[PDB]
Design a protein around this ligand. Sequence first.
Ligand SMILES: COc1cc2nccc(Nc3[nH]nc(C)c3C)c2cc1S(=O)(=O)C(C)(C)C
Ligand SMILES: COc1cc2nccc(Nc3[nH]nc(C)c3C)c2cc1S(=O)(=O)C(C)(C)C
Lengths: 282, 280
Amino acid sequence: AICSALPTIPYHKLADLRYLSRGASGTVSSARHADWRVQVAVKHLRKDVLREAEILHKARFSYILPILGICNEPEFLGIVTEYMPNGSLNELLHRKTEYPDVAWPLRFRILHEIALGVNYLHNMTPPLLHHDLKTQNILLDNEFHVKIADFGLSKWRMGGTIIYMPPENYEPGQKSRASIKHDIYSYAVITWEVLSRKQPFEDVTNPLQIMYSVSQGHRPVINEESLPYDIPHRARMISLIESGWAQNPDERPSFLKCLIELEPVLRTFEEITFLEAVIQLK
Amino acid sequence: AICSALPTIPYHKLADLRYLSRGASGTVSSARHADWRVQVAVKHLLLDSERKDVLREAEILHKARFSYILPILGICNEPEFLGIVTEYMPNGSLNELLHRKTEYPDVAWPLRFRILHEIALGVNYLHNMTPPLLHHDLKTQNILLDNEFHVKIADFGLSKWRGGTIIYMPPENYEPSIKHDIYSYAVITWEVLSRKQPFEDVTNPLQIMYSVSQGHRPVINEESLPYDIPHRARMISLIESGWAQNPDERPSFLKCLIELEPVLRTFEEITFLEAVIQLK
Ligand SMILES: COc1cc2nccc(Nc3[nH]nc(C)c3C)c2cc1S(=O)(=O)C(C)(C)C
Ligand SMILES: COc1cc2nccc(Nc3[nH]nc(C)c3C)c2cc1S(=O)(=O)C(C)(C)C
């Protein structure tokens, strides 16, 4: 029966408000809270903003973007969260000039924390299904620890890129929106993307042509060029990817199964290697 | 009107339960959550008032959620067992970091200043709540350190909405205030910058209490606070105003933070990372 209320933040308490990005969800800005003396992120532009705040507030966990409050005024409506200084996983994987090396321990830690975050959502009462996982909404804190964001399409078990969407979701309905095998598919594509640092379906022009290929059973390429033979635990990771993005949803594993497979892999990395991987990025 | 409920954790979902420490508040054990696959910490203990105290602590932790407050994950509320489940802090307490000198020969200045800044950020947040939450039991022992040595404030047993060690207690509190936490903070600051035990040459805690009531404080000289400390004069000023005999002369955490902000800006981000790697 222990209940915590989300604080209401007056818009005038946000100082040094600076534009970060503009998306479908709305505009993201950075700011500093004048009383709390911390940096914050603000997602702004009704019911859909409040629904996302409610989900973030209820789904609080170590690998979920921490919500600090809501701006609910006639003048302004926005979601206030902790500021993620290292942006998104998408930026880390594809900004190769900015990041020439992303050490294996760190890539494996990121994959483990994404699975830990999604598993938590799935274990809630009732289960919370993300349904829009992408490298763009896997955010990175000051020490490159994962924070999952974007709960706009996230539904309680009661436009942009399609590369993380299972083929059965292309023509939606009751069954597809209800599916508990959607997030694992997205996770399988993210895993491939993290281990290769390549754009899934890079050689395909139209995203509609990607959709046609995926429905036939075609997936991002698994070979020596995309996934080199020097990748730690390559065979095990390939097995996880291929089961995760299987055409038949029934053949895709649960996040629990995924985590039990990843735990021995993560134990082979000494703690200092995670620290060294992060310093290499600065 | 957005409300979040604290999850109830069945005791059987806590695997590898191992003793860590025993305190006045209760026993602390480490464990792993069988479904969530994460390491956790459990603070556990049979009386109506004793049960109510644990529920009070869990309520405070749940309501006072913030970046520098120990994150609560759930409550174990069973006939068989009653406990508070939180994130596991792998680096223990600030007390251990400052005084285990063989384990930690160097604690670089950027990290010491970052710790001091995060303690002030955490306490300021508590003070800014509606109504204000006053810690009233700040000590180096309940300043916990996460995997990257970021601060998490714990122990909300004595924390009130507006025993043990007396070294962090203002003299007016001996015979029973929004000016208690700043006093504790001033002692913690001295302790962080010196790595010495406050009043180390005293054989009885009553001798500390008598000294403090007479306006005497931990020594500030070249031996305790060397001349090579970054921003030494400013830090000494903060310490001395923070532990002033007259509570009215002690600053607010807002003032304290405005004082610390330019100090923290002089350190490049990579120096914090290098300070942590030096500890491993
Ligand atoms: C450094 O760039 C960003 C930092 C962010 N920190 C926290 C949250 C962000 N976005 C967000 N998602 N959902 C909510 C409710 C909020 C505030 C952040 C977003 C960015 S960004 O927009 O520049 C990026 C890296 C995603 C393009
Ligand atoms: C590594 O040692 C500890 C880690 C801890 N991690 C999280 C919480 C702890 N204590 C706690 N305080 N309040 C609550 C509700 C809880 C669970 C931790 C305590 C320890 S310890 O007891 O070994 C130490 C370092 C304080 C002596």
